[PDB]
Design a protein around this ligand. Structure first.
Ligand SMILES: Cc1cc2nc3c(=O)[nH]c(=O)nc-3n(C[C@H](O)[C@H](O)[C@H](O)COP(=O)(O)O)c2cc1C
Length: 362
């Protein structure tokens, strides 16, 4: 089938089309938010994927919203990431980094100096984040009250993204994925429910899509379009945040803007039944007419759904998450039609090797 054929995603050529979606695991070394050698073994076992989009990596210390998430702003962090990308490349694999800014989804205890997290508006998130207790295990705590970002502070955010993209090329990554999704800073400014600003960065799709389109333009200049990809969640409710009443009209604007820049790929996170309506083939046809590059689909995907959409030319690859968590040889299991290992969800956040590198291969 086409799920096992090469695809040109940006400047690299993926071996297959069964990608590994970004999966936050909260296994970094604290203090410092430094990747660990155990994470290198984790990504090494799953190098069979055509493209490995790493866990959400903070662009700066202000972007730390989850205790245990890795960073790519410190020299000690870039050193560990260089060792991880080396192992993935040593197994004929391709790995990409997902740069994010947690924004309002954060806790003041993790922010530098105990300050309140930043956001487009001071509206709360309503969701919960993950911290660490005395024993180091993950605990669910409510998000702190965010602070409205000042217009003079927005160029500082764009610069930290460009600096993180620069460190990503230094860390040996093949591509970069920007977390414009799941109710995070770049999303917080894209959804009317999250951005009640009155400046040039709020109040209209153009004003609510400028910041993200800027970071995309910053990456295009620092590295190149072939190396910059974006994950978007334009339709549906993800992590207690919706996309306003004109989600479909505002989606086609940002997609057409990203389609005129020639970015590497477009990773669309699809909602389940609780979030919203599934992606209609009429809506997918509108997205493909504006974005002429590789489109990566994720969200309750099966091998049947992936093959059908790839044949229709609506998507070029599929990204699995929990299946890659529990099946390190997922590409082998899906081609041989074998059984998938059970997913132990209690070990998805925090802990050690249990639930991380203990899943056996075929
Ligand atoms: C433990 C866990 C952590 C996740 N962390 C991220 C993240 O950091 N950034 C992101 O874009 N998506 C994240 N996701 C969502 C996945 O990327 C993927 O879109 C989602 O799991 C789709 O479900 P699926 O496995 O059925 O395809 C996470 C999912 C899980 C289960």
């Amino acid at each position: 089938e086409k799920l096992y054929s090469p695809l040109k995603v940006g400047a690299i050529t993926a071996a297959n089309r069964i990608f590994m979606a970004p999966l936050t695991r909260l296994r970094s070394i604290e203090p410092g938010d430094i990747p660990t050698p155990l994470m290198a073994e984790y990504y090494r076992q799953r190098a069979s994927a055509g493209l490995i989009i790493s866990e959400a990596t903070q662009i700066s210390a202000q972007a730390k919203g989850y205790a245990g998430a890795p960073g790519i702003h410190s020299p000690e962090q870039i050193a560990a990431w260089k060792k991880i990308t080396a192992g993935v490349h040593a197994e004929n694999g391709h790995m990409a980094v997902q740069l994010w800014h947690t924004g309002r989804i954060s806790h003041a205890s993790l922010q530098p100096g105990g300050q309140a997290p930043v956001a487009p508006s001071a509206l709360s998130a309503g969701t919960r984040t993950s911290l660490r207790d005395e024993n180091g295990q993950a605990i669910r705590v409510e998000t702190s009250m965010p602070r409205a970002l000042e217009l003079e502070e927005i160029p500082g955010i764009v610069n930290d993204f460009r600096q993180a993209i620069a460190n990503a090329r230094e860390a040996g990554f093949d591509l970069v994925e920007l977390h414009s999704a799941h109710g995070y800073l770049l999303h917080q400014f894209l959804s009317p429910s999250s951005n009640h600003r009155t400046d040039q960065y709020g109040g209209s799709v153009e004003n609510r899509a400028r910041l993200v389109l800027e970071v995309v333009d910053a990456g295009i200049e620092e590295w190149g379009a072939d190396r910059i990809g974006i994950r978007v969640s334009p339709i549906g409710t993800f992590q207690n945040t919706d996309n306003g009443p004109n989600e479909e009209a505002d989606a086609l604007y940002l997609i057409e803007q990203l389609g005129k820049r020639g970015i590497a790929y477009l990773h669309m996170s699809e909602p389940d039944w609780a979030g919203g309506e599934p992606y209609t083939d009429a809506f997918r046809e509108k997205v493909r007419a504006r974005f002429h590059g590789p489109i990566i689909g994720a969200g309750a995907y099966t091998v049947e759904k992936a093959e059908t959409l790839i044949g229709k030319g609506l998507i070029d690859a599929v990204a699995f998450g929990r299946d890659w968590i529990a099946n390190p040889d997922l590409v082998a299991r899906l081609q041989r039609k074998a059984e998938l290992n059970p997913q132990r969800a209690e070990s998805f956040y925090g802990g050690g090797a249990e639930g991380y590198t203990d899943y056996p291969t075929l």
